[model samples]
Target: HHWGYGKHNGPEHWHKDFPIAKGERQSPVDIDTHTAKYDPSLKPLSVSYDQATSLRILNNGHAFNVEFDDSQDKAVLKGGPLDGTYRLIQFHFHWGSLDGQGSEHTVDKKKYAAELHLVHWNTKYGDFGKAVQQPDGLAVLGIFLKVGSAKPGLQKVVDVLDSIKTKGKSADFTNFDPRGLLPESLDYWTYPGSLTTPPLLECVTWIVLKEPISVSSEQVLKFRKLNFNGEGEPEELMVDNWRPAQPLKNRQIKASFK
Candidate 1:
C-alpha cells in the first residue's frame, strides 16, 4: 500500500521496503530488437481462451485488472517460452497521463501509448501463490498499444470503467474474449524478468509481441478518467502508473522470429 507511482513512493523508492525491486531480473526492460537473438528452436506461442472464463474487472489502486475464472484450464497459454500449461488469471494495463509515452517495456528505446499484460500461472505449481515462488512459475504476454484506429475489442473493457471509477471498486465483466485484442503476428521477444511492480518477484517468462495493436486517442482518454483514490479520500487520477525500464544485466533476449 505504501508503494505507488508518485515521486515519493514510486519505483525509485520501492527498494527501501522491497529489496527485490532492484534484483537482477527486474522487468519492464528496454527491448533492443537489433541485438535480440533469433532462436529457431523457439516455437510459436499457443494461446487459447474461453470467453466465458472472464469474471470481473476491478480497480486495485495501481491499475484496473480484468480477472478470469482460473479454477480450470479453460483459458490457458502454452508453448513459446513456457514448458507446460499456464492458466490465465488476470490482465491489466499501464498508461501515461498523455499519449506520447506510457508503455513500460520500450522497443528500441521507443515508447508506446500503452501496454497490456496477460498474467498466467503454471499449473505444475498448484496455484498462483505457490507458482509465483518458482523460477518457471509464471508466463506474461505483453502487447503494446499504439495510437491509431479505435480497437473494437477494447471498447468492451473501456465501457466498464465507469463502474469501477475508484480504487478497490469492481463490476461484473463476463463473457469477454481476450484473444480479440491480440495482434496478427505472434512473433515476439522472450526473456527472464520479474514483476514490474512491488515484491518484484523474478518468476515471469516475458513474451512481448513485436506487432502492436491500435487504440484511438479517444479510447486512451477513457482510461485516464479512472481514479487512484477511493471514494472521499481526495481524488487522484490514475495516470503514469508504469514503471521505468530496468537494466537487462546478464539476461539474453531471445526472439521467436528473425
Candidate 2:
C-alpha cells in the first residue's frame, strides 16, 4: 500500500494520482508523539472512553459527524468549570474529493484520503466562538483513516452517503452511536498545534489517536461521490470540492503514555 514517491514514495505517490493530495495537509502517519524531551508540569485531564458515551449522528454530508451527550463532560480541560461544568466544544473534520483518500497528520510522509476531527472547548470561559482564540481554549481530537478491512460499524455512514449523494444536501441520521465506531484502544499523543485549515487558529490541544477505525474501500468511493454533484455535479456525478493542506510550522507533537 506504500506508493513510494517523492522522498518517501508515499505521499509523493499521491501526487501521481490526485494533484490536490499533496496540495492539502492530508493526514497519513497522522500522529507523532512528543520527543520524550520535555515533560509538562501539568498533565492532560484524565477521563475514560465512557466519558464519550451518549452519542448522536448528524447529517453533515461530508460524513455522519457525531455529538456525545452531556452526561459526564467534565473529564478533561482547563479554566473549565474547573469543577465539572466544562462543555466540550463542537468538532468536525477535513478530507479530500478524489483519488480515493484525504486527511492531514501524515506518518513517514504517507497520507490517507480523509481525516476526522473532534473539537472541544473550555467551559470556564463560557463561549464557543470566543474560546477559539485562546491556547487552552480548545481541545481537538484527530484520527487518521486508512484503507483495509471493512468495518460493519461504518455501514451506517454508507447508508447516509447513499441517500444524499450530493453537495450541500444532508438528512438526519438514525440508529448510530458515534462512540461505538471509534477504535477500542484509547491511547493517544498530544501537542500544541494550530488548525490545518483557514483561520488556521493556533492554541489548539491536538490529540491524534494512535489507532484509527478500519474503513471500507467502498466508503472511499462514497466520499468522492459526495462532492458538488448530488442534485447534479458534486454528487455521484459533480465537481470535487476539497480543501488544500496547510503548512506545519515549528511544532512538535507529544504523547500521553511516554
Candidate 3:
C-alpha cells in the first residue's frame, strides 16, 4: 500500500502490489446514468444515526476521515441494495486541486468538484476489517459535492480542516450526524465495486446519490491548504487525492429511481 497519487505511485502503478486492483468490480467508477437500469424493487434508503457515536476525526495523509464508534448498532444503514444492517464505521472525501473535475464518479461524463463517502460494514460479518474482505459485507454511500452556496452542515466539517492541517492530526468531533450532509432525495445508483485504496478489496456495494450537495469555493481552498507531510517533513499539499475511474466490464448498475 505504499502507493499514492503521484507519477510513480498513482493508480496506474497500484496493480504492481495490489493484484485485485484490476478486479472486475473496482470502485470509484464513472457512472453513466443513461445506461443504468432502473430497478423499482430497490428499497428506499433507511438510515438511523446516533450523533454521539461519532468518535474523532483524523487526517490520515490520504484523506480526512471522520471516524465513528461502530462497536454497537447505534448508527446503521439498511434498505436500498443492502440485505442486512451495516454499521456505520467512518466517512471521508476525495477531491482534486481545482474545481470542475475532482469527483471520482461522473454523470454522463460530467464531473463534480468533489465526492463524499460514508463507509459501513455488515453486522453479520462482525467487524469492518473482517467484513471488508467478503462480498456484500461493505456498503458505501457516495455523495457528490459541487461548488456553489456554502453548505452549513458541511461547513462544520470544513471548519476543523485547519486544526488537522498536517497528517496524523486528530480532534474530537462528536455529536455530528452525517445524514445531515446528504441530498434531499435518496435516489441513487448501486453497483458492486472495490475499495479505492490499498488491498483494493472488492467487497463494496456502492450507492451513489443522483443529487449533488453544495460547497463553497473557499471551503475547497481550505482543503487544498492541508499538507500530506508533517511539521518537520517536506511540504506536500493534499490535493487530487482521488483514484481514477476503472473499467465497467459487464457488471449491471441498478438505479433506485427513474
Candidate with best TM-score: 1
**RMSD per model, one decimal:** 0.9, 8.2, 1.2
Please give the range of 10 consecutive residues that has the lowest summed lDDT in model 3.
47-56
Query: lDDT of all predictions, in order shown?
Result: 0.93, 0.52, 0.88
TM-score head-to-head 1 vs 2, winner: 1
Off by over 4 Å in 1: none
User: Which lDDT tens digits does candidate 2 get at residues 153-231?
Assistant: 6676666666655545555553444455567665566666655433445646666666777777776567555443336
- Best by lDDT, which number? 1
Better of 1 and 2 by lDDT: 1
Steric collisions counted per model: 0, 32, 0
- Candidate 2 TM-score over all chains jointly: 0.65
- Residues 1-258 of candidate 1 have per-residue lDDT tens digits of 499999899999999999998889999899998889999999989988753389999999999999999997689999997899999999999999889889999999999999999999999999999999999899999999999999999999998898899998999998899988999999999999988998899999999999999999889999999999998898999999999999899999999897
Order by TM-score, highest first? 1, 3, 2
Model 2 residue 135 distance off true place after TM-score fit, in angstroms: 2.2
Worst 10 residues of 2 by lDDT: 75-84
Scored against the true structure, residue 236 in model 3 reaches a CA lDDT of: 93
1-258: candidate 3 lDDT, tens digit per residue: 478887889889999999989888888788887799999999999988754288888999888999999887888999998998999899999899889777888888888889999999999988887898799989999999999988888877889899999988999998887877888888889999989988889999999999999888988778888888877799899989888888999898899888
Candidate ranking under lDDT, highest first, comes to 1, 3, 2
